[PDB]
Amino acid sequence: MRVGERFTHDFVVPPHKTVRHLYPESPEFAEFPEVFATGFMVGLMEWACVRAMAPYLEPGEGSLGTAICVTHTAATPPGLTVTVTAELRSVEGRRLSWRVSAHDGVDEIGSGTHERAVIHLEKFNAKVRQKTP
Amino acid sequence: MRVGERFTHDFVVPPHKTVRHLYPESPEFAEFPEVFATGFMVGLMEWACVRAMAPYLEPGEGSLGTAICVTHTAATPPGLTVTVTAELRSVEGRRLSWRVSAHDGVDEIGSGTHERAVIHLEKFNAKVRQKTP
């Protein structure tokens, strides 16, 4: 791949990416303001990093976020466009560490780091089964 | 609210808390193995901390997650119970901090920290609609 290279990822926040949508089973979340959930932003960031990685992956390969360390310092109503900038910080065998940050056009809404791990998709699928009830 | 206290929170992972459910708008995610998305683990850990600090809010108050720093070291298939243990680490004002960790019954699946800011609901919704298109 290549260290230092920014990758950019644009996404319009729909009404169904707010807090109560993350966990419709949570009574507590049902009464949260209609803003972009942190867990959804995290998902977005992994999504940016997955796309950055895709060309460099062998057929049948994938990745799992192994760590996420970000702030979430400004709220985002549906309608705004969240831009995730991902930057490769290091590659270490199957290990990728990114610097990530996001912006909704008005504010930087969060920034931090995100490590991923390249996996064989089937071997991993098999492994997750010996674990299913 | 007492530093050191512990709140646990149990959750059976349904099928709709997997990666492809965090972002169905992602073709890059539709591949992915049916496993507990990092984005949902982050939310589940926040849900624990929200309940833990529920008895600390005054009326017309809420909380926002303002930082999540956690590992994700094992995959959980739908069917397993994820228990989130939230340990109050600091209460220094409008700011709460937790040490969080999760177990799915077989593996510790992740841990780290999470911070929350007490907010005035009205002023906050007001600031938000100042951002809404």
Residue by residue, what is the 3-state secondary structure of chain B? CCCCCEEEEEEECCHHHEHHHHCCCCHHHHCCCCCECHHHHHHHHHHHHHHHHHHHCCCCEEEEEEEEEEECCCCCCCCCEEEEEEEEEEECCCEEEEEEEEECCCCEEEEEEEEEEEEEHHHHHHHHHCCCC
Of A47, A77, A133, the CB nearest to B131: A77
Q: What are phi and psi of B36, to 5 degrees?
A: -55, 105
Nearest CA in chain B to A35: B128
| Residue whose token pair is 């409008």 | B94
The CATH number linked to B78 is: 3.10.129.10
Q: CA-CA distances (angstroms) from residue A14 to A26, A49, A71, B44?
A: 20, 21, 21, 21
Q: How far apart are CA B112 and CA B92, in angstroms?
A: 19
Paired residues of B61 in beta bridges: B120
Q: Kindly state the helix (H) or strand (E) to which residue A89 belongs, with its residue range.
A: strand A81-92
Q: How far is CA A26 from the centre of its chain?
A: 22
Using a CB-CB distance cutoff of 8 angstroms, which residues of chain B are in contact with residue A22?
Answer: 39-40, 43
Give exposure, B33-70, as e/b (b: 16+ Cβ within 10 Å): bbbbbbbbbbbbbbbbbbbbbeeeeeeeebbbbbbbbb
Strands B61-71 and A95-103: unpaired
Q: Which tokens is A36 given?
A: 């972009």
Using a CB-CB distance cutoff of 8 angstroms, which residues of chain B are in contact with residue A47?
Answer: 23, 26, 28-29
- Alpha helical stretches, state H, chain A: 19-22, 27-30, 38-53, 121-129
Is B38 considered catalytic here? yes
Nearest CA in chain B to A132: B77
* CB pair distance less than 8 Å for A121 and B31: yes
Comparing CA positions, the residue from A97, A47, A124 lying closest to residue B74 is: A124
Q: State yes or no: B39 annotated in a binding site.
A: yes
Task: Give which of A17, A25, A44, A64 to mutate to test B binding, by max B Cβ within 10 Å.
Answer: A64
Q: How far is CA B9 from the centre of its chain?
A: 11
- This PDB structure is determined at a resolution in Å of 2.5
Q: Which tokens is A82 given?
A: 């969240």
Determine whether B109 is exposed, middle or buried from the number of CB atoms within 10 Å of its CB (0-12, 13-18, 19+).
buried
Of A47, A124, A127, the CB nearest to B28: A47
Q: How far apart are CA B130 and CA B133, in angstroms?
A: 8
Enclosing domain of residue A57: 1-133
Number of domains into which chain B is organized: 1
Q: Which tokens is A129 given?
A: 């089964």
Task: Give which of A23, A100, A122 to mutate to test B binding, by max B Cβ within 10 Å.
Answer: A23
Q: Technique behind this structure?
A: X-ray
